[PDB]
Amino acid sequence: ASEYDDPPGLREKAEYLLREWVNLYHSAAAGRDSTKAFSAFVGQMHQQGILKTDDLITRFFRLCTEMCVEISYRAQAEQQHNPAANPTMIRAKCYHNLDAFVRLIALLVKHSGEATNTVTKINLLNKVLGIVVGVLLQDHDVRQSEFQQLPYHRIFIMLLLELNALETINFQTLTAFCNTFHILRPTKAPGFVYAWLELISHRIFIARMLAHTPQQKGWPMYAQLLIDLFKYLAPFLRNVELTKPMQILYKGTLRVLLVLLHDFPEFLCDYHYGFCDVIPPNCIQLRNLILSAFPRNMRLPDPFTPNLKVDMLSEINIAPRILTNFTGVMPPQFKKDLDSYLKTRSPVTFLSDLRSNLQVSNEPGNRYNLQLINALVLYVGTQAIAHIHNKGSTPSMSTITHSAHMDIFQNLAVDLDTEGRYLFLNAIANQLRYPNSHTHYFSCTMLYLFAEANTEAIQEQITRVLLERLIVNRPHPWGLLITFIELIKNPAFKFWNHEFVEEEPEIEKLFQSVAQCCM
Amino acid sequence: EMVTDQFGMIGLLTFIRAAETDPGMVHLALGSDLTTLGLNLNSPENLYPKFASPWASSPCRPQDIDFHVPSEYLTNIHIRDKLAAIKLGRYGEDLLFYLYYMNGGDVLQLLAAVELFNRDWRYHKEERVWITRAPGMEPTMKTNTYERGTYYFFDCLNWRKVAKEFHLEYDKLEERPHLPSTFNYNPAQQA
Amino acid sequence: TDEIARSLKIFAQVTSMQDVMQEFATNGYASDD
Amino acid sequence: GPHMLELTKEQLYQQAMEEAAWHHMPHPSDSERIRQYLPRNPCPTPPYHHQMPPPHSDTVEFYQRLSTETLFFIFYYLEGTKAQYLAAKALKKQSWRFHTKYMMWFQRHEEPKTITDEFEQGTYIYFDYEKWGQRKKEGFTFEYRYLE
C-alpha cells in the first residue's frame, strides 16, 4: 500500500507494534535497559510474522522510522497551528517516540549477536543506519524547505550513545557511524548540515574518533568528515556569498577547529595539506588555524626575540609529517617530465609549458588548477631539500638558489599573471609553519623570490600574501612571522616600501597594524 | 606602477575598508577575536569532553553529561507521582544559589533570581554578586541615594554567605527580575 | 540469506511504591526534629 | 551581473535547504537524554548576570560544599547524570546511606540500638521526597539487603 512494494497490512502491523513498544519503554519496571519488555516484545514481533524474512525485518525498520518522522512533523504542526501550545512539551512528544525507537534498534542489534557474533551484529547496525539514511534523503528531497532534521538527529546521536555504554566492535560501530555521516555530508543532505556538524563535533564522537582510537585509525576517517565540511563551505566562502545561516555555520566550523587545534594539534598538523587544498585562499583565519597547529611539547622561539638565529634551531633540519599523498594531483606524464627537469635541467620547453600545464581555463571561473599548483610547490621544495641533503649541505639562503628547483619557482614568479602568482605564493606561504625543514626551505625561497624580483608587481604580491595573513586576528603561524620579519629587514623591501608607501599613505597603517596585532 | 588588480596591496586595503560597510558577523579578510567564541583556549585541560555544540557559548554542565549511575539511583520510574513538584518557594537559600549559578542562560536562573529577590536578596549589576541585610544590621549611614552598613554577599567561589561592610548604590542594584515570554527561543540561530 | 532474522527468531524462543510506602509507615515511628 | 549566480544551481539549492534548516536549528535538548523535571529552557538573560557557572563546580569537592537539600534535589530531579552521581558521592561522604527499597537517604542520628549481619535498628534522620524535607524516625530497621 505504501510508495514501496510493501506487503498488505504491514504499515498497520508495524505502527501497532511500535505504538506498543513506545508505551512499554515508558512503562515501570520494564527492565533497567528495557530488558524485561524487549525479550517479550521480540516474541510479539515474531508472532506478528515480521521476524519471518530479513526483507520484512528491514521493512519494519523503515516503517518505524517514517512513523517517528510523521509524529515529529505533526508535533511540529501543533506547535505552530497553535501558538498557545507548550514548545518544551512538543519536543518531549518527539523525544518520547524517538528514544523508544532507538532502544528497540540498540536492543535488536546487541541481541542479534548470536553466540557473541561480530559480523551479524554489525551488519544489522549497518542495515538500520542505511534504512534511516534512506528515509532521511527521501524526506529531505520531497519535503524540501519543510524538511525537519530532529527525528534523524536524535536517532543518530542516541544510537551512538546507547552503543557506546568490545573495543574492536566499538571500532566497527564507529566506522559504521562514520560512513553514515559521510553519506549525509552537507553536499548530499544540505538541510541536515546543522545536525550533521552537531554529530561530527559531538563530545563523545570526537573522543572516540580521535583520542580513544587504535593506532590513530580514526584520524584519516575523521579527517575525511572535515574535508566534506570544507568542500561544502568552499563555494560560499570563495564567493563571499555569506548569508546569516552561512555565518552561523562558519562560526560553528571555527569553534570545532579551535577545539581540534587545542586538543589534537598533531591531528591538524598531519592533515594540513588535505585541509588546505579545499579551503579557499580567501579564508585567512580558518586556514591559519590549520597552519598554526604544531606538534605538542615543542618549544617555539618568540619570532620577535631580538637577534634570533633560526639556523641554530636543531628542528629546522627535521621534516614535518605529511599524511596526504599530494604527488597524486600530478598527471603521471607531468611528474615524469618534472623529475626529468629537476635532475637534467633540460629541456627549457618545460618552464614555458609549465605555466600552461597549471592552467585549467576548461573549467569555468577558476582558470587555474589550484590543487596542482599546491602539489608542484610542495613537491619541488621537498625534492630540493633532499637534493641539498644529498649534496652534504643544508637548506640555506645560498644552498637553495641556482638549482633546477629554484628555476621552476623563479620562472613561476616571472611567467605567471597576478592571479597565477597569487595562487603560487599562497602555496609557498602554506608551508611557513612551525620550525621544520619545509618551513625553513620555503621561508628562504619566499625571501629570495622578493630579493631577486625584477618586477615591482612580484614584490607587492609577496608583501600582500605575508601581510594579509598577519593583519587578521590570531593564530599566526611561526614560520609566517619569521619570513615577514626577515623580509622587512632587506634593503630590497626598505626601498620598495619607501616608493609604494608615499603613492598610498593608507598602506603605512597596515604595516603598523602588524607590530601590535602579533606583538 | 602598482598592481591595479585585486591581488595587490590595493586589493587588500579594499577588503579592510569593506568591513566598515559589511554588516556580516564574518569578515574573512580580518578575522574574529577567537577568545570571544566562548572557548577556554587557555585551559590546560582538554575542551572536547565539555564541548556542548558548535553553536553553544558555554561548556557542558554536569546536569548535561549523562553517567551510567548505579541502577538503584534511577528512582523516578518508581516515585514519579508521589515525588514533590518543583516549588522554588519551598526550597532553601543554598538550593536557590545552586539553581541560579548552575542554570545560567535558562529560565531557571531567573526563577531562582525571583525567589531570592522575594527573600530580600538584591543583585549588584557592577560587582556581579547577591547582597542582603545581616540580622538587624541596619546601615550606619542612611540616605535615599545609597546605604552604608554590614551586608551578606554570596561568594560562589567558596560557596558561602560572606560578611562585607561597604557602601552600596541603590541604582547599581538590580530591580525585580524579568521573564522573557520569547516563543521557540534558540540561542544557536543568532550566534 | 535471512541470517539476522533467525538470530532474533531463536532469541524469541527464550523467556509498587504504594505498598512499599505503606510498609514504611509500619517500619518505625516517624517524627520531626 | 548577479554575483550569486556565480554559484551553481546545485550550490543555490544547497544554500536554500541550509537557509530553511536555519529556521529550525537543533535545540540543545535534541542530542540529550530527556530531562523530566528540569528540561532546557534557553532564554535571553542579561550580560550582567552569571552566563556561566563558577569554575570547577563539577568536582565532588564542590558538591560537598552544597547543602544536603541541594544534594537531595540534584539526586531526585537530575536522575542519571554526572551531577546525580556526584551528589550521591558527596551525600555518601557526608555519612548518608541510600535505602534501595524506600528510595531515600538515611543517616544515623544516634548509634544503632542493634547491629546484626542482616540489619541495624536505631533512630535515623531521612529525607521525604514528597513532603520535601528532613524527617526523624525512631526504631527504624535498616535491612543491609537494601543498603548495598
Q: Which domain holds residue B93?
A: 1-191
Q: Nearest 5°: phi and psi at B24?
A: -65, 170
Which residues on C lie below 8 Å from D125 (Cβ)?
33
Residue linked to cell 512539551: A89
- Alpha-carbon distance of A512 to B13, in angstroms, equals 13
Helix orientation angle between A54-80 and A87-110, rounded to the nearest 10 degrees: 170
Per-position b or e across A377-402, b if 16+ CB within 10 A of its CB: bbbbbbbbbebbeeeeebbeeebbbe
Cell reading at C16: 509498587
Contact A168, A111 (CB under 8 A): no
Residues sharing a CB contact under 8 Å with residue A511, sequence separation 6 or more, in sequence order: A467, A488, A497
A106 interfacial to chain C (CB closer than 8 Å): no
A191 touches chain D (CB under 8 A): yes
Breaks (C-N over 2.5 A) in chain A follow: 165
Q: Could you give the dihedral angle defined by the CA atoms of residues A169, A172, A177 and A182, in that order, rounded to the nearest 10 degrees?
A: 170
Query: Is residue A271 classed as helix, strand or coil in its secondary structure?
Result: coil
Chain B residue with Cα closest to C17: B78
The sheet with strand B151-155 has its strands ordered as B122-124, B129-133, B151-155, B160-164
Q: Give CA–CA dist A442/A446, Å, rounded.
A: 6
Going by C-alpha positions, the residue among B22, B5, B32 that lies closest to residue A241 is: B22
Report the CATH number that the domain containing residue D95 is assigned in CATH: 2.30.30.1020
Write out the three cell numbers for A337. 617530465
Q: Tell me, yes or no, if A322 comes closer than 8 A to chain C by beta carbon.
A: no
In angstroms, the CA B139 to CA B145 distance is 13
Q: What Å distances lie between residue A273 and A123, A358, A410, CA to CA?
A: 34, 18, 23
Report chain A residues whose CB lies below 8 A from the CB of C6.
114
Q: After which residues is chain C broken (C to N over 2.5 A)?
A: 15
Kindly state the DSSP code that residue A320 receives in the 8-state scheme. P
Contacts of D65 in chain B (CB under 8 A): 158-160
C-alpha span between D73 and D56 (Å, rounded) = 20
Residue range(s) defining the domain that contains residue D147: 1-148
Instruction: Give chain B's largest Cα–Cα span.
Output: 85
Closest Cβ–Cβ partner in A40, A51, A108 for C15: A40
Distance CA A393, CA A386 (A): 10
Q: What's the CA angle centered on A51, arms A48 and A56, to 5 degrees?
A: 95
d(CA A287, CA A274): 11
- In the structure grid, which three cell numbers stand for residue D58, read together? 563539577
Grid coordinates belonging to A114: 548470536
Closest residue in chain B to residue A240, using alpha carbons only? B28
Show residues of chain C in contact with A57, CB under 8 Å: 2, 4-5, 8
Provide the pairing of β-strand B146-148 with B141-142: antiparallel
- For B71, counting Cβ atoms within 10 Å of its Cβ (0-12 exposed, 13-18 middle, 19+ buried), the class is exposed
- Count Cα atoms within 13 angstroms, Cβ side, for B18: 14
| Domain count along chain D | 1
Cα angle A315-A321-A322, degrees, rounded to a multiple of 5? 140
- Integer Cα distance of A145 and B18 in angstroms: 33
User: Burial level of A236, CB count in 10 A (0-12/13-18/19+)?
Assistant: buried
Report the neighbours of C using a cutoff of 3 or more CB pairs below 8 angstroms. Answer: A, B, D
| 8 A C-beta contact, residue A112 and residue C8 | yes
Q: Identify residue A138 by its one-letter amino acid code.
A: Q
User: What SS3 class is residue A368?
Assistant: strand
Cell numbers 540500638 correspond to D113
CA D16, CA D72: separation in Å to the nearest integer?
49
Handedness of CA A117, A118, A123, A129 (dihedral sign): positive
DSSP string across chain D: --GGGGS-HHHHHHHHHHHHHHHTPPPGGGGS---SSS---B----TTS-SSPPTT-SSHHHHHHS-HHHHHHHHHHTTTBHHHHHHHHHHHHTT-EEETTTTEEEEESS--SEE-SSEEEEEEEEEETTTTEEEEEEEEEEETTTT-
With contact defined as beta carbons under 8 Å apart, do A126 and A159 qualify?
Answer: no
Longest Cα–Cα distance of chain D, Å, equals 92
Q: Which residue of C has its CA nearest to A49?
A: C9
SS3 A71: helix
Q: What is the DSSP letter of C30?
A: E
- Residue holding cell 607531468? A334
Beta strands in A362-444 (DSSP E): 367-368
Closest CA to D44 of B120, A368, A215, B104: B104
Contact B69 D38 (CB under 8 A): no
User: Kind and range of the H or E element at C29?
Assistant: strand C29-30
User: Torsion angle, CA of A276/A404/A459/A239, rounded to 10 degrees?
Assistant: -30
Amino acid at A380: V
C8 and B CB contact within 8 Å: no
Instruction: Note whether B92 contacts D: Cβ–Cβ < 8 A.
Output: yes
A367: which DSSP letter? E
- By 3-state DSSP, what share of chain A in percent is helix, strand and coil, each rounded to 5? 70, 0, 30
Domain total of chain B? 1
d(CA A16, CA A30): 19
Helices A437-451 and A370-390 cross at an angle (nearest 10°) of: 100
Q: What radius of gyration, in Å, describes the C-alpha atoms of chain D?
A: 25
N- to C-terminal Cα separation, chain B: 44
- From the CA of C18, how many Å to the nearest CA of chain B? 9
**Which cell goes with A57?**
525485518
Q: What residues are paired with A26 via a beta bridge?
A: none
What is the distance between the alpha carbons of residues A5 and A501, in angstroms, rounded to a whole number? 74
Whether the CB-CB separation of D26 and A194 falls below 8 Å is answered with: yes
State how far the Cα of D106 lies from the Cα of B139, in Å rounded to an integer.
43
The 8-class DSSP code of residue A146 comes to: G
**What amino acid occupies position A126?**
N
**How far is the CA of A293 from the CAs of A211, A261, A316, A432, B37, in angstroms?**
17, 6, 16, 12, 18
| Euclidean distance between CA atoms D68 and D74, whole angstroms | 10
Neighbour-count burial of A516, counting CB atoms closer than 10 A to its CB (0-12 exposed, 13-18 middle, 19+ buried): exposed
Question: A400 phi and psi, to 5 degrees?
Answer: -85, -25
Distance CA A292, CA A472 (A): 13
Q: What are the residues whose beta carbons fall under 8 Å from the beta carbon of D56, sequence distance 6 or more? A: D62
CATH code for the domain in which residue B94 is found: 2.30.30.1020
Closest CA to A486 of A358, A341, A310, A325: A310
Q: How far apart are CA B50 and CA A425, in angstroms?
A: 39
3-state SS assignment for residue A305: coil
* Number of Cα atoms under 13 Å in the Cβ half of residue C9: 14
**Closest listed residue to residue A51, CA positions, set B39, C3, D39, D93:** C3
SS (H, E, C) chain B: CCCCCCCCHHHHHHHHHHHHHCCCCCCCCCCCCHHHHCCCCCCCCCCHHHCCCCCCCCCCCCCCCECCCCHHHCCHHHHCCCCCCCCCCCCCHHHHHHHHHHCCCEHHHHHHHHHHHCCCCEEECCCCEEEEECCCCCCCEECCCEEECCEEEEECCCCEEEEECCEEECCCECCCCCCCCCCCCCCCCCC
Selected residues 93-122 of chain B with any CB under 8 Å from a CB in chain D: 94-95, 98, 100-110, 113
Q: Collect all residues with Cβ–Cβ distance below 8 Å to A325 and sequence separation of at least 6.
A: none
Contact B1 A256 (CB under 8 A): no
DSSP code string of A460-511: HHHHHHHHHHHHSSSP--HHHHHHHHHHTTSHHHHHHHHHHHHH-TTHHHHH
- Nearest CA to A413 out of A371, A387, A451 is that of A451
CA-angle at A351, arms to A346 and A355, nearest 5°: 155
With an 8 Å Cβ cutoff, is B78 touching chain C? yes
CB B59 within 8 A of CB A263: no
- The Cβ of residue D25 has, within 10 Å, a number of other Cβ atoms equal to 21
